[PDB]
Design a protein around this ligand. Sequence first.
Ligand SMILES: [Zn+2]
Ligand SMILES: [Zn+2]
Length: 825
Amino acid sequence: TWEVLQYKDSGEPGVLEVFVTINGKVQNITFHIPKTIYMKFKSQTMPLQKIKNCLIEKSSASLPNNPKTSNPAGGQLFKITLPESVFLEEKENCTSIFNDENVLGVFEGTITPHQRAIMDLGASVTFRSKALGKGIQQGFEMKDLSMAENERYLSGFSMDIGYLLHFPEFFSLFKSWGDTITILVINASSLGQIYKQMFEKKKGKIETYSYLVDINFEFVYFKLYRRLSQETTKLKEERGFLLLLQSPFITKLLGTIRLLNQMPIVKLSLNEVLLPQLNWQPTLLKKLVNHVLSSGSWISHLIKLSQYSNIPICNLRLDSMDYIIDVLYARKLKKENIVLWWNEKAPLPDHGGIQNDFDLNTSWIMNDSEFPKINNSGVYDNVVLDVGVDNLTVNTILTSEFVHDAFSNDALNVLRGMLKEWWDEALKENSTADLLVNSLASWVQNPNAKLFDGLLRYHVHNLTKKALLQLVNEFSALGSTIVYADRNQILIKTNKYSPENCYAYSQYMMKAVRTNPMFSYLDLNIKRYWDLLIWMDKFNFSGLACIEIEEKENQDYTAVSQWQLKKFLSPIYQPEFEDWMMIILDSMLKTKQSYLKLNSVENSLNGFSHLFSKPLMKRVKKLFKNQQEFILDPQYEADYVIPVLPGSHLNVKNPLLELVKSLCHVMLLSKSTILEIRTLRKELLKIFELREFAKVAEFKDPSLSLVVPDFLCEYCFFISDIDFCKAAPESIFSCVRCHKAFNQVLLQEHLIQKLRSDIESYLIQDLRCSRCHKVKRDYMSAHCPCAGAWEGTLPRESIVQKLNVFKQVAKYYGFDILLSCIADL
Ligand SMILES: [Zn+2]
Ligand SMILES: [Zn+2]
């Protein structure tokens, strides 16, 4: 029984070395692992070439279901296990088994012996030879003697540590058993005071993790760049000890220092560190001191994760949570009869070489990430409940030959059982299982993780959409009206009128929804209660809301107003807008309260425009007169300047016209007092020399939309869309729940990916006839057999407008990568 610290392949094929903890100190052992591949060689009779030393057997493993691969053809799959060296010298010649006729492809040729060892053997390896000397002088073979013992506790750790860092010439070193600090090319006092300060700040953590790492030390700030090798040599011939390295140039520092390859290393890469160009010393002191005094917590977390996941400590990382998913899922599939389709250095599943070819179906299922939503605009006097839904994806996963687009059902059941046991273990006080469940969704989304298949992602997305529509159906079964629907927020209209009377009722819908077996794992929460709502859009609403209904006391009512429409008005009329909107909201609240006092038409709101009609008429007359008098003056031209914003497309002249158009369009959403609003609109338009149904008096959307689907916040595993045009600032650059700033070049890269996907989709579109809407079924034909000529399903003007709005977006903010992408066309 040995606790393995690291697995590492040698420069020889199939030869591996392990830094392992022998019963004494650390020690290194050389291994040998043969290769194993999956082949579809000939139909049923093959040129075996049995003289070559290999083990050949016909198997019946479960192959992946490629959408392009519709013909089973031959089915005599073969498992081939074969030492790597003979594979290398047989790759040289052409007349060999691996390259012959009717070779459909190899399925497990991209799995290194390192990965096979780390999955099948694990960290808890032992021997049952019952030749130890002969096997220790040489490399001991694995495939004949192999078994994994239990790993409940890895080891009782008591051993020194290493610490090498770099901040883009801030190379740093520290020894746990040493007592000196020297930094490569006021500072000493700051270092001492900061060390003491955070010492008292984290006394508790220091005391708890002292048994892992344990104190003041000297300070120094030192041609000079050759000292890394000398220090590494001093440490190497002074101690055997584990290296903690932190730098954005991991491989560069590994290659520059030749001695770093002879000890096990635990890596703590947290890159993207920058200097503020001034007073970098205090912040760098903060960074180094927090890293040093949190190293104990870091190594404790790594020890927990390693001794739970059966993974060596040097192969793990704090952010490499997808690695555990991959390891566990791969080993459970290997215990099954399913090929792993494991892939390396490529974010695509391995299919035997077929995946290299372009295909229409795969490309269509790759870029179809749009999530639809439901929005029923209108004016509501009833109470509305604002709720949020959580853990939707995991509930969807756990809940629920002919179809060529299907994802393998055996893998789906395997992962469903894996997630079920994960949930069961997480319920019984397991933080690791909780974090793993939280990161499962991000593992599903991210193509960077191995064992990733676009078919699985499309399957999960379609299932999520179906589950959401089923939830909408269940909600609408009772007395309800869905106003807004989304992956994160749902607005429900309540049939009642008073918020105080919806306590038990809302609790009853909550309980009934939760008890449904389809929605057993959903988490639902109530955020706000709406007394009076004017809802037309997610970014455009205003009304009176109460946070939570209280007992025996009148609730606190606060008015809110979110309106990007006001941002497109003239600078001098926005005060008029914000005044008159509040006035009309007050009048609406007054008339609803009066109607409730008294007791498709509703009398709660009928008769509200009568309160403010005459003052509005006089105010509009005065505003028109003043605009007429002061529009041509030079010094008054500042306040009449029409603002420009990204996504704007309307060119228009008179601001007062758009002011009154927006004011009337807000009222028009009543859907029950249409005639009164139309009469008032005609009366207002009579002040101008316009008519009731003129084209100039029609309100439109002053802004376009540019939505990016499923942006991921790593700090929350939070998934949401983001609109670059309609949304207000200081929200594009930060998460919705947490206030963490987003990376910018990531935003530009995602925008460019969206643009290129749009262009490709336009390029690969289909053709449709004019009179009949049948699709083109010939590669070359003048026109339809009937009358009419072909037209594209994707109009040119749409993509032209999309590129125009992309240009506007790239011009408003500073996005030089996107501008370079545009200029290359
Ligand atoms: Zn966040
Ligand atoms: Zn036709």
